[PDB]
Design a protein around this ligand. Sequence first.
Ligand SMILES: CCCCCCCCCCCCCCCCCC(=O)OC[C@H](COP(=O)([O-])OCC(O)COP(=O)([O-])OC[C@@H](COC(=O)CCCCCCCCCCCCCCCCC)OC(=O)CCCCCCCCCCCCCCCCC)OC(=O)CCCCCCCCCCCCCCCCC
Ligand SMILES: CCCCCCCCCCCCCCCCCC(=O)OC[C@H](COP(=O)([O-])OCC(O)COP(=O)([O-])OC[C@@H](COC(=O)CCCCCCCCCCCCCCCCC)OC(=O)CCCCCCCCCCCCCCCCC)OC(=O)CCCCCCCCCCCCCCCCC
Ligand SMILES: CCCCCCCCCCCCCCCCCC(=O)OC[C@H](COP(=O)([O-])OCC(O)COP(=O)([O-])OC[C@@H](COC(=O)CCCCCCCCCCCCCCCCC)OC(=O)CCCCCCCCCCCCCCCCC)OC(=O)CCCCCCCCCCCCCCCCC
Ligand SMILES: CCCCCCCCCCCCCCCCCC(=O)OC[C@H](COP(=O)([O-])OCC(O)COP(=O)([O-])OC[C@@H](COC(=O)CCCCCCCCCCCCCCCCC)OC(=O)CCCCCCCCCCCCCCCCC)OC(=O)CCCCCCCCCCCCCCCCC
Ligand SMILES: CCCCCCCC/C=C/CCCCCCCC(=O)OC[C@H](COP(=O)(O)OCCN)OC(=O)CCCCCCC/C=C/CCCCCCCC
Ligand SMILES: CCCCCCCC/C=C\CCCCCCCC(=O)OC[C@H](COP(=O)(O)OCCN)OC(=O)CCCCCCC/C=C/CCCCCCCC
Ligand SMILES: CCCCCCCC/C=C\CCCCCCCC(=O)OC[C@H](COP(=O)(O)OCCN)OC(=O)CCCCCCC/C=C/CCCCCCCC
Ligand SMILES: CCCCCCCCCCCCCCCC(=O)OC[C@H](COP(=O)(O)O)OC(=O)CCCCCCCCCCCCCCC
Lengths: 73, 93, 124, 100, 152, 62, 75, 141, 100, 230, 54
Amino acid sequence: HIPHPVKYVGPRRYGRYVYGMNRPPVLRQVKDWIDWTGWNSVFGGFSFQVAFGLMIVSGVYLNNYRATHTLYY
Amino acid sequence: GSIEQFINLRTARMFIYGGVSAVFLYKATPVMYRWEMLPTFLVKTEAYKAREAMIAFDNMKGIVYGPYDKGGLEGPPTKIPETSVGMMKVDPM
Amino acid sequence: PPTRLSTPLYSEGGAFTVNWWRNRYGLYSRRQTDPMLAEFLFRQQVKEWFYDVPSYNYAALVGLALGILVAVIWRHFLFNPDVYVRRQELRKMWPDRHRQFAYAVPYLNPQLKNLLLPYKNSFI
Amino acid sequence: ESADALFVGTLDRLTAEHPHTDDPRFAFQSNQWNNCELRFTQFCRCTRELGEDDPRCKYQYYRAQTVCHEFLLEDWMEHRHRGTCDLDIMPDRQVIHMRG
Amino acid sequence: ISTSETLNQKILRWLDVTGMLTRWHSRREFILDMDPYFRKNSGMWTEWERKTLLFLFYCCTLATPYSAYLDLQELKHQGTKPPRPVSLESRFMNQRRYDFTWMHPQDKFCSECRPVELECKKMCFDRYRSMDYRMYGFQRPRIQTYYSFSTC
Amino acid sequence: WIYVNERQREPQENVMDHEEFFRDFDSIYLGQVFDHHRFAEWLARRRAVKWGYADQIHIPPV
Amino acid sequence: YKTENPLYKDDEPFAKTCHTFDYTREGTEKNGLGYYCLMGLWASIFIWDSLYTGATMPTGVHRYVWGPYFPTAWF
Amino acid sequence: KHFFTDGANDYVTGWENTPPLKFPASVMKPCDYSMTKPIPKHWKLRGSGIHGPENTDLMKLVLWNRLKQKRPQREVPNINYLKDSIRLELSVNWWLMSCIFLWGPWLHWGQEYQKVHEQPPWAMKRIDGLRGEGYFTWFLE
Amino acid sequence: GRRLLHGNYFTRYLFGSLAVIWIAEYAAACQYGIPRHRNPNWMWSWWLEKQNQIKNGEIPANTPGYAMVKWNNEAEQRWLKTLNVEAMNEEFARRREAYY
Amino acid sequence: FELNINIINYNYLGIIITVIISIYIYNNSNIISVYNSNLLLININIWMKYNILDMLNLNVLDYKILLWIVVIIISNEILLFVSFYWIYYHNYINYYHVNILILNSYNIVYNNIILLTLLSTIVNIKFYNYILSYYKYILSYLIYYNNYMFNNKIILEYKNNSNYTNDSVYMTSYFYIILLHYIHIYDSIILIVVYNYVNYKNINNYYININIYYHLIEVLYIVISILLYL
Amino acid sequence: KASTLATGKGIPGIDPKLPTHTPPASYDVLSSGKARPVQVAKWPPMPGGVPLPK
Ligand SMILES: CCCCCCCCCCCCCCCCCC(=O)OC[C@H](COP(=O)([O-])OCC(O)COP(=O)([O-])OC[C@@H](COC(=O)CCCCCCCCCCCCCCCCC)OC(=O)CCCCCCCCCCCCCCCCC)OC(=O)CCCCCCCCCCCCCCCCC
Ligand SMILES: CCCCCCCCCCCCCCCCCC(=O)OC[C@H](COP(=O)([O-])OCC(O)COP(=O)([O-])OC[C@@H](COC(=O)CCCCCCCCCCCCCCCCC)OC(=O)CCCCCCCCCCCCCCCCC)OC(=O)CCCCCCCCCCCCCCCCC
Ligand SMILES: CCCCCCCCCCCCCCCCCC(=O)OC[C@H](COP(=O)([O-])OCC(O)COP(=O)([O-])OC[C@@H](COC(=O)CCCCCCCCCCCCCCCCC)OC(=O)CCCCCCCCCCCCCCCCC)OC(=O)CCCCCCCCCCCCCCCCC
Ligand SMILES: CCCCCCCCCCCCCCCCCC(=O)OC[C@H](COP(=O)([O-])OCC(O)COP(=O)([O-])OC[C@@H](COC(=O)CCCCCCCCCCCCCCCCC)OC(=O)CCCCCCCCCCCCCCCCC)OC(=O)CCCCCCCCCCCCCCCCC
Ligand SMILES: CCCCCCCC/C=C/CCCCCCCC(=O)OC[C@H](COP(=O)(O)OCCN)OC(=O)CCCCCCC/C=C/CCCCCCCC
Ligand SMILES: CCCCCCCC/C=C\CCCCCCCC(=O)OC[C@H](COP(=O)(O)OCCN)OC(=O)CCCCCCC/C=C/CCCCCCCC
Ligand SMILES: CCCCCCCC/C=C\CCCCCCCC(=O)OC[C@H](COP(=O)(O)OCCN)OC(=O)CCCCCCC/C=C/CCCCCCCC
Ligand SMILES: CCCCCCCCCCCCCCCC(=O)OC[C@H](COP(=O)(O)O)OC(=O)CCCCCCCCCCCCCCC
């Protein structure tokens, strides 16, 4: 373990919830939440499915389309 | 000069963004149709109709009473066993 | 091997070093309860095992055996015609497995077989 | 009439002219079970195209006998005659690609 | 309709009908929703831990309906599984050295049928019934029973 | 309860004739995905014919 | 007075003693550029093998501007 | 962390080999007397000399490890520690999201295409007359 | 807080191992010169010719493979007695008209 | 002072449990086996009672000893699955060209993966609450619903499958590998039914054991899914 | 903060007194004293900055 600072640089408090007034845009809020809880969990969790999905769906071009246009017989 | 008045940055982000979107849909929609990506209820592809036209629900043949077909000229049994006749508890009609 | 805790132990950088070993040696230890005692026990183990000259001979042997073990396992999967991992050829009858048959002849003629077969006359 | 004619055309020809020698596809292994299955499948396909009476398919059966023990062939030939030999099932009636 | 609130406030209110959003945005509301015994330990929680716990909890519960939908579709698929061709008994298919009796070592019901071969057992139970020996199952039409997942 | 509830029902028609299946492969193999309601009704009628209680039951129309 | 929110404070260092823990020179904390290069190569080999099926069976005709013993010929 | 380790992740007893960095060295310090200057010859050994509680630092380490177990408030860790504590939980949750929103859509698309064209969209169409879906994972063919 | 394994060990040794396996396999193929083009079809030449004839329309559609061979097993002889390709085609034609 | 360890002098469960095992061999009726299994369950519970009572000794090494025992047990479970994978892949050369219908790669795999992932998320939330000294009643009932669906799906799949154990070594290995996973799912039900809040918290070996075991079952299914369905 | 060279005195960005960039400030009158002319464009600029004849 190497000690290191906290990388979160977004706002630390939005203030008291008052019927959802004076709060950031929703997309900005989603970005802040993932910054707060760590992008490392997002990348690790999504990595496996992204790798599998890309490999399978790439065959639409690599295996199906190219093969039809590239058969020397 | 008479058209300069109609350029107002909203018209430039409604023509430029609206124009690129139109090209994207114009060029992408045929591809989605070909690859069966469009919703079925919205439209059915010709390939979809060709397959569906081959489907019927009135075939009552091939009923067999054995797990295996052991070859030969007789094939799997096709007659219900006598002991199994009238063994179903059917609610009154 | 120093005998005084004041004298530091030289360590290199990397994944297998004195510092790397110190960090992990006492993770599961109930006996290393303070710095002085922890260092004493750490140096005791390092002195007993890593400064023992004959121990390095066994390190060489495990490396050689494992190296051969990994190579033979990998070679079977990569080159052996009879070993199947992909399924394209297994979905066809035997006469149609053209791609698999490509492994047969080259796998039948490894270099060492050619070198050593001529030495049969030392036995017969 | 060429020195390498055996290899040319097919790998099959190699053991057709030298029935009692190793087949190039299975020479690496002592176990010849897969060799027997390939030979039998070849005999099954010959009859479909040429018919049993053809001398070619008669020799293909002999090639199978060169590597297949008789107790195997008798059982497999029985399945072929009935129509349950998985080797001889016609391609359009295979189920290998069904349900996955 | 109510015009005393914005459209966003109205949408948030209804999504909060069970109080989930209110508990998320109020520490006091969250701790008071705990039972008294566990509220004793709530003071030690950081806001990071509290909201992170709710995020994991809400994602799990919100995903449960989706899994239920998949399971229901799976049950419907199995409930109306299309028939498949009868298997040709190949060279190494359907080999038996002895009858199937490991389920019933002493009774030896359906010795010829395999442990989960339902159609074989049905005809075998019918023989036993015809011999004045009761057996349970395979008598009610699938469309006349509940939980069949085979109704039109 | 799951086992007991299912055991009461007649078994589904697991298999059919080998040749008849292939002569109507598209309908049988793909019938479920295209129209599951009609396909389910078709299965019920076959089960009624198979076990000889078709005349004793009224299969709802689809 | 002035205070720091504990949530955003830095990690405490290992104590400096006779028995000091140090991971600074190990280089095991995170995957490095070499790992991401291996991933890039794996993607390239995966795409390349599918795109160009005849790559494994290359042509035997050899044509060199400066012959076969010139460095550019070797690669 | 989930797994218990006597050295680092000792949550069963809470023992720590060294005191907190908050305390001044005068108040409490790590138990290290490796740098002790040579003892004068005229000094005489009164105690055992055995490593143990006679040494002040070890006594204070034992005392603190027992008396630290009651504290008025929580000692709040930084967000880095809190992230690490539930790293597996957060990652499994994101994996569930990926299955629902990435795998599900393209798996559904493949089945629909397979219905119309007899084979998945990522497979070469056959010309050999065999019927059925065929393989799914094309790159393992 | 002390670490025993690589900071990203799980992803490192899973994706890393898969990458090394894939790259090693490509190297092995190059050394042995194995063809890497994928064929999803059976290679029986006579059968492929018959399938092409069906596609060209020379052979009536939905004609079984056993209807085209020179040797039939017992099970196929059973099926040939009930085979009516002409009737099957008419039934399919009727279905298309109803659908459209 | 006191002895480092409070010795256990006598025990009689060992005789009872061993005799219960023998009754399985010497049965003349399968009904006796069913009732014998209940006795085994009862006596194993008594042994678990002794472990809880040992807390009175206040021995720091007791937690560590039991934790490492579980690690060894986990390894044995993994190696048992390895043998089944070994059996499956030995006959790999005989698969995929025999006239049997192998399982689809679209329906069963996806819902099971989704279903088992939810099970992991529930257990993860239990661990988080255990860290925070907190409890949520609904969590246990989510597991029961999860286990109910898994049982319902697997039962139907076996009954509607058109191939049998005697058809091919492929089918035998498919059924056996899936059953072995189910048995480990059922063992999880045996463990999770007693989940409660205990006020001595992080010195309770049960919580760490359950988290490790549930994770093992789920990861094993990923390997099974890749081998058989995909 | 930026009190000594070690703390960052004289380093743009770190030192408060020195800005990261020194862009010229806008003006409303030319140095001659003429008012700065204003031109509101409605079409993109010429490809090469070519001026049109008066
Ligand atoms: C391709 C796509 C598909 C992929 C499919 C993949 C399938 C995988 C199947 C896996 C099945 C599930 C198994 C794990 C279930 C539990 C999961 C869990 O809870 O994880 C989170 C959790 C994370 O822990 P944490 O403390 O929160 O860590 C926080 C951070 O991660 C940071 O933590 P940290 O780094 O600071 O370290 C703390 C933590 C770090 O540890 C972990 O977190 C462990 C994570 C493991 C996850 C699984 C990854 C795969 C591992 C493969 C190992 C292969 C072994 C070699 C095989 C050789 C074959 C020839 O330490 C521990 O927890 C210690 C645990 C005790 C380890 C005991 C090991 C005994 C065996 C030693 C080797 C024996 C051979 C010696 C040979 C040489 C002789 C000279 O893990 C645990 O706590 C699990 C520990 C308890 C279970 C251990 C099981 C050990 C089994 C040993 C088998 C030995 C067999 C030897 C013979 C074999 C050949 C004959
Ligand atoms: C002119 C022509 C132009 C042509 C242009 C062509 C363009 C082509 C584009 C190609 C692009 C290629 C890109 C390559 C470079 C990639 C660079 C990169 O980012 O690499 C690293 C990147 C990520 O690695 P990383 O940086 O280490 O990750 C950072 C982490 O945050 C590290 O942080 P961490 O370690 O803290 O992470 C969190 C970690 C923290 O760990 C812990 O908390 C400690 C405990 C760990 C041990 C856990 C033990 C077990 C846990 C139990 C719980 C299980 C829950 C689930 C239960 C399921 C039950 C069913 O925990 C976890 O991650 C594990 C727990 C989460 C749940 C695990 C779920 C199970 C996983 C195992 C099974 C996986 C297989 C599933 C298969 C499906 C289902 C069967 O790697 C990849 O993404 C892999 C590369 C894939 C390459 C594919 C190439 C082929 C495809 C090409 C597609 C395009 C072709 C199109 C055609 C073109 C024709 C021309
Ligand atoms: C105008 C009204 C509009 C209503 C719209 C419908 C909304 C229905 C929502 C149902 C959500 C169920 C989620 C189940 C997972 C477990 C949830 C949980 O953790 O509960 C903890 C909660 C409290 O646990 P605790 O341990 O005391 O506290 C733990 C926390 O500290 C504190 O826990 P917490 O307070 O944070 O809990 C947060 C939340 C966490 O969960 C969620 O937020 C998940 C939300 C998922 C939404 C699912 C919507 C499904 C709707 C599908 C409709 C499809 C229609 C198709 C049409 C086809 C046309 C052809 O949990 C709940 O709020 C669960 C529901 C509570 C209701 C309990 C009373 C009995 C059921 C009443 C149902 C009334 C329905 C009225 C419909 C009227 C429509 C005009 O547990 C209970 O209350 C006890 C057990 C009962 C809960 C489950 C009740 C299931 C009711 C299902 C109703 C919908 C059926 C749709 C059938 C469609 C067939 C086609
Ligand atoms: C699907 C997704 C698609 C995503 C789309 C995303 C779109 C994003 C937004 C796009 C917005 C574009 C417009 C914004 C305004 C322009 C930008 C601007 O002013 O920036 C400031 C920028 C610089 O500002 P400044 O620094 O303040 O000005 C100082 C200087 O006075 C001026 O600065 P300077 O002195 O530096 O010079 C400016 C510039 C001069 O400006 C340009 O060069 C502009 C070029 C525009 C080209 C557009 C047409 C070509 C593309 C056609 C695509 C067809 C697609 C067909 C699809 C079919 C589908 C079925 O010169 C250079 O930068 C020097 C370039 C040197 C390299 C040249 C290399 C040439 C190599 C050729 C080799 C060929 C060899 C083979 C022979 C081939 C023979 C054919 O201003 C300029 O660049 C001024 C000129 C602007 C001209 C804009 C022309 C727009 C044309 C639109 C045509 C639409 C037709 C629609 C047809 C019907 C539709 C249904
Ligand atoms: C100014 C520019 C604006 C641009 C806006 C772009 C909008 C793009 C919107 C894209 C929407 C795509 C929706 C795809 C949903 C597919 C759902 C689906 O297939 O559901 C079925 C499947 C389960 O079905 P089964 O029968 O079980 O089969 C699979 C397992 N056996 O369920 C799921 O897939 C559930 C997951 C739902 C995924 C939803 C994806 C939504 C994507 C939204 C993208 C929005 C982009 C916005 C961009 C804005 C830029 C300014
Ligand atoms: C066991 C089968 C399981 C199938 C699982 C399917 C999912 C695939 C992904 C996970 C498994 C990893 C394998 C991926 C392979 C990808 C490339 C591929 O298809 O390779 C096929 C290729 C061979 O297939 P065929 O062409 O049919 O045979 C030709 C003649 N033999 O397979 C291989 O060579 C790779 C298979 C082995 C991979 C595992 C690594 C092998 C070495 C193990 C060494 C073990 C000893 C100890 C090592 C210590 C290391 C620190
Ligand atoms: C209050 C009552 C509650 C009941 C419900 C809840 C509790 C449930 C407990 C867990 C049940 C787990 C059951 C595990 C065995 C499942 C058996 C099974 O399915 O076997 C069949 C399945 C597939 O077979 P086919 O029918 O050919 O498949 C074709 C598909 N149509 O696999 C097998 O055949 C293998 C069978 C292995 C059974 C092993 C179980 C242990 C049996 C031991 C008997 C020993 C008897 C000798 C005396 C010693 C007594 C200990
Ligand atoms: C017991 C069986 C276990 C399972 C089987 C495992 C077998 C394989 C295991 C390998 C080790 C896995 C972990 C690897 C971790 C890792 O990535 O480790 C990453 C390291 C770099 O480390 P850092 O980046 O962390 O410092 O990479 C390496 O040391 C090697 C990989 C980098 C890329 C190598 C390039 C190879 C070139 C090949 C020729 C290409 C030709 C192209 C022509 C155009």
